[PDB]
Symmetry: D2
Subunit: 436 residues, 4 copies
Amino acid sequence: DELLDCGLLSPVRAGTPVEALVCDSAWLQAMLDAEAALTRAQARTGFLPAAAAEAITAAARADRIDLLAVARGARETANPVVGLVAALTAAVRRDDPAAAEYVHRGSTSQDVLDTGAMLVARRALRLIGDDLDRAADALAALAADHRDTPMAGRTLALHAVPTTFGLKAAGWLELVSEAAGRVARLRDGLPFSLGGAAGTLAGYFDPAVLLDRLLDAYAAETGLARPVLPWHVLRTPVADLAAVLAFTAGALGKIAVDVQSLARTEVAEVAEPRNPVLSTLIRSAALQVPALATGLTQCLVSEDERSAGAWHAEWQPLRECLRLTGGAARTAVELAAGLEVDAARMRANLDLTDGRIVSESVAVALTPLLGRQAAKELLTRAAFTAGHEGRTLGEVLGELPELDGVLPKERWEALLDPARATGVAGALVDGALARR
Amino acid sequence: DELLDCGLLSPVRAGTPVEALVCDSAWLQAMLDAEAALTRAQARTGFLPAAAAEAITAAARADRIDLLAVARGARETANPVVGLVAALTAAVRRDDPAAAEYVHRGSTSQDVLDTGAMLVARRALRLIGDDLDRAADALAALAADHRDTPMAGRTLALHAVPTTFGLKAAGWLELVSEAAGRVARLRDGLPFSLGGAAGTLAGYFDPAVLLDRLLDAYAAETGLARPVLPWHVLRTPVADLAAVLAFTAGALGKIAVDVQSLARTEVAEVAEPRNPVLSTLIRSAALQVPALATGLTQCLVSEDERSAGAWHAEWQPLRECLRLTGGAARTAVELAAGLEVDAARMRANLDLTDGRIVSESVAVALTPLLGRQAAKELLTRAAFTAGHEGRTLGEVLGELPELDGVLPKERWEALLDPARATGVAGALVDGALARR
Amino acid sequence: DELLDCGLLSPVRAGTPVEALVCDSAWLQAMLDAEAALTRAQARTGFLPAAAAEAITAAARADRIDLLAVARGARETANPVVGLVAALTAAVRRDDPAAAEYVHRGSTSQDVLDTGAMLVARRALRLIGDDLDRAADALAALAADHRDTPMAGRTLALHAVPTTFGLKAAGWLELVSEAAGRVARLRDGLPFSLGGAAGTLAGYFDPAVLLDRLLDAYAAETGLARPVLPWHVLRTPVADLAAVLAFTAGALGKIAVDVQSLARTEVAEVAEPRNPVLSTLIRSAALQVPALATGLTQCLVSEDERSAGAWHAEWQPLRECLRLTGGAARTAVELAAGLEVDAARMRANLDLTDGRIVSESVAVALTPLLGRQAAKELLTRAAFTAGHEGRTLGEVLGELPELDGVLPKERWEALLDPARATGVAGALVDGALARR
Amino acid sequence: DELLDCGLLSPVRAGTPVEALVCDSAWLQAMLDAEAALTRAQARTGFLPAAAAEAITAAARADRIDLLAVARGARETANPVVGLVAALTAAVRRDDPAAAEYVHRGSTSQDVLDTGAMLVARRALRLIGDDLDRAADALAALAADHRDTPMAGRTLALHAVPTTFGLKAAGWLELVSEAAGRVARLRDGLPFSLGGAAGTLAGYFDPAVLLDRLLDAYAAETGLARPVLPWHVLRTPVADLAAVLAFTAGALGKIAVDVQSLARTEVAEVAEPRNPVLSTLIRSAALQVPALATGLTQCLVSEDERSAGAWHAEWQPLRECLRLTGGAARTAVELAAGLEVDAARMRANLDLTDGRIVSESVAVALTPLLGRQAAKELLTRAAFTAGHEGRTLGEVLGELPELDGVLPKERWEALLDPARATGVAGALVDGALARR
């Protein structure tokens, strides 16, 4: 039928857990959760009877509600909360006519919708963070295992100097760990929305005493944070979600394009657990989320006490950012857990420039006996000459009169070995891993 | 259930016709249409039997296929076409085992998916264009009716000089008409995708003769345009859809913010057919589509013969651009057909600056008798003085010695009438409407 | 001449201090600062003579260098550091031929360019943060002064319920204070770049001991933070700058569109220190920075050990984000310091809906005597009837039999007074201001 | 000094001709050109003396004006035209006091600024189009020369089937030719801006007769197109520039990433005229322009008769899009003219998958003797087995009993030759080149 979203156009998240958390029914449920938490908190502060709150809570179930009718009725007010409230009120009235007068008491559409949005975000970010933690575990393992696995460092698409795959993986780990930390902190900071019609909370009511009691109760009932001010037009939580999800998707995209560079036919230094489809999916989300994030970020420009459109522009892209990033994280776990590292092919590929990739380290080694300027000039000359003649760097070095007898044979064998010129990659990996 | 997309987060398109054209099932159907058209065209050029094409065509129905299984299986290849092909092949094999060997003959995932994407786009743009035409009809009617309806022209949020609502509406008409023309031409130019594994069409086969015959047949079977080259990495149709849909959404967004400016409480010069929810919905799409369009446009950077991610990043945002823009167009029709213009309130609001809004036209009128520089200086002085004293511009003018007896009384009454200083707005509306 | 950038196209920053911090000459100077700090730190750890570091430091002045030649020579390597290094080396060699062999010792283009970029960012963010602090001071003053200044709360462009300008200004304050805090923390966290050719630091050299000593020395010489890992392809600082500057520009944009809504001709509740040009300029930056930020954020996808283009795409938009946001902040200070609040016009505008804006608070007041449902129904009926008849809400209320003798006259006079139905706006302002 | 823009942060355009066309002084000159054209056209239609127009034209030179003062004074009105007009008026008054009364007669800031913007765009697009034409010439030459140069087609980063470099280059040609055509048509369609204070042209004046005469004269004096309506808030030309420049930058970005894929160390099939810096620069612009374009496109949402910020947000990004795209085009010419194609290395790389890259073409060849299903199964089996055993595809084929004596030896030698399985790449190149 025409109502099914199966993820047909978005394989990066199709079949992944985040789908179930951010589908339309889950958002309907989140808005019902926000209503019932509102009633319960109002009862806890004395504004209505506890039994009416229990009845509303019991009726506040997505299966009591006609999802399609609510969605299709929203065009009349440009949001779904008026229809939702009517449906919940009828559902409560069926079982408890006294309780129905307290459904949505003193409230406004945006408190319920935004509170539900932060509930959905909070649950979805719990999943994204747990997946980022698993990915980080597999990456830290790859980093420790390959601390001493040499490979060609590549800059501007060409071999530069040798590095280690452990160092590369530790950069991956650094990105994923940063993302998981930001996801956790953002999750702990998402607030409820309790402002009333235009942010004065007039319908919900020393004014300071009652404000404090109600705000504490609604924090307790929702599990969300208490904000200093109603934020109907202070869209900091939405901008923060946009920033954190675009950072996360971009970091995973970094891992994805590195994997694709290593996995291509004529490199073949890693393989995915034979197209590299996992990195293709991660990359697909990486090319989508930042553009959605900029629309989210632009909605900070929200006029008056409720914008005539900029708030409405937030819901779908936010959901999609949660969905895509969720898929990408799940896919990243599969990638980092399953990556196949071909150390021997990395070692072989180190020889592709016929010694030129160690010329910097040879220049350094010759600096005590030649000077820095003379050694650098001699080595760039030898690298060019070896490139033209299709000979090894060491071959051209063994023909320059200036180098005759300059170093013992064994030291030359050590110097021209690409696997030994990795700088301090080992110490850097140790330092990154001690942070865990 | 968790699979329902009801438009709960996107009221601008919930319940509108475009939904049915661009849902997941409609895309599945479009890919089946592309397969069956491929078989039929191959039969028309002699590469397989006509009966096998009829059998495949008959089986190529979305209700023969498990949508959810195809979507969930796509993670193995990062696209849904391999699973789709297996399901269609089984469905054909049930009724006709000989025909099943010709399902997806010589083809590749991207020919089918991209061809289906252009089928979906073509049908969705048929709807968007027809709606833009209806909106343009209502706007041209508003433009003709209010050719002589005076109102305050507003620049940088303040009254500037008088204009007419007919001229404003004719600008609306100009934008919508431009969009409808671009939608129609783009629709007539969307091509099929027939490239094979890496753009050589090797599996489908003077090579020029067979190429021409097959390309003509596939054009006939699909109704899509024949491209000069396979475009698996030449993403011009996608960039063009992105450009046209973002232009359309932005134009409708212009109408929406104008309506909101006119409809606010302390202006009240128009009303929607009492929050202005239609313009809120149009604006909501206007704040979403250009950001999706930039991701689409960036996918022009598609490496090799098939990108490992940038092509995959296109499907969902493209669908969403079609969906949102579709909603916005439908909503725009409702807005332009139902707008309530309060001419009397426009006339009253013209007097809000106490004559200052005609000071430019008074300066012009005094230029024969004072000079341009002296008249401009005198009128800015009088506008300031009238602003401070809370008096009419004409009051301050009737106290300057330099103006004593400068113009007859009746000419002053004509000059200070805001409804008569509209420039050539009437001629401009006539010129815009003669274009129809 | 053709080399002048005077801000002709960007008045929001033309003539503001940030220009001088982020112009081309300032970036040249920052890269020279990064070179000289590198030499000094290498001398402090024992790798070269202290006198050579003093000579390089003395020569490392933008006026010793041909800016235009460096910029125009950069096309050969796609960055300006090779030309810069040659020019600094010649300049040192003129005065001290021994010191010139240590210019750019063991270094790479990206360490110098990225370190200079973080120096520029750090200085520019010092200015942005100080300006945001001044703006926050003026906003907190407006919030305290107008805690009890009543005005129409506006939602979806229409009067909703009354609020106070103090509450509005306190939301402005909340945004600016959040931005200033994030700017300060980001500034304290920007790191230097010290990676070498491909992130192993091979040219700069227990390996852990020497790493730690050099990293500490370079932190001391630059004043920048020490990162856990070389970040040539771990673009977290750039993404963080993008996020913080787009948040800042959007927050200021919120203030700007609120000011424009209040300042328009038929509202006139505030005036800028007579077009509202300051808010126009702030808004102009708000519509630019988030789009630049998304390109910055997308550069997290940086392949290999140095991207062939994505790193190069960062410099100009980053500079522009610093520049625009800087202008916007400076302009925001001028706006918040100079805003003219017309309390009497706010009070008058409260009466524009002829009492309908207090109907919610009347419904609440009648709930003890009528019930919630009956009171809400009665008041929406009376609001409609009063709208049609062009009469006051209280007029229609005084004609319904159901309300006869329901409340004493004085209580009705209090109830229909828009200035008294502000909810708990006062307590909310007190709570926001106690945070200072 | 602090005013120099040398392109230090943007090597893709530093030292290229477009800089001189779009610098601040060039925009000042364009606005002076728009003023003088306005005076001349007004004289041609009879509204002022021809001699006053000649005097204004003679004084309307950027070297008569203080650029820095105009730019810095613009903060008072949020645009530079009031200061420009004062400076031009003084300059005319020095030589001709009578002519100075006709400077900026009946005009408004936006007519002059937007007309100058379209003058700058028109000249810059002349350059961009000529460069795109040169690039297209070199690409068509590469396409003809390498029509028969075989190479590995690569999809999702792996060898797929063989293609030709001629076909690849012909796709490059198709993109560049499309861009050059769109640039030329857009250039021929850019209009002047002549609206007056709020789009009625009241200050400039059968009203239809005078409108037509003045509009024709201003078209003649500017060389720009005559629009149907004043477009102060109908931002179609700006959106069109945004679309065309982002398309152009993305197309060139496609060529750039293809070059980088071919040029990397372990592929080495092409080389740039030894880092690939030209493609790095093109790519750098490709990652910048679409994000700037989305801000431009969003400015279609321009409220009232002149937006309080959205028009102001256009100037700098538009200039930058012109600048970057200009650089990219110039760089693309250098790249396409200088590319070094290593056909022998392409042929060698075809053998990297040990025959697996022809397995599809072997399957086709066996279909008459085995069936399609059986041949495909046999070849995927043989490809896997050959992959595991590190043997050639033909080796594993020569061991299956089912293939014994199936084809003569010579036919096997032809079949397993990667250079002969290119599909109809030759015919496709012929067809693309016949379009010239």
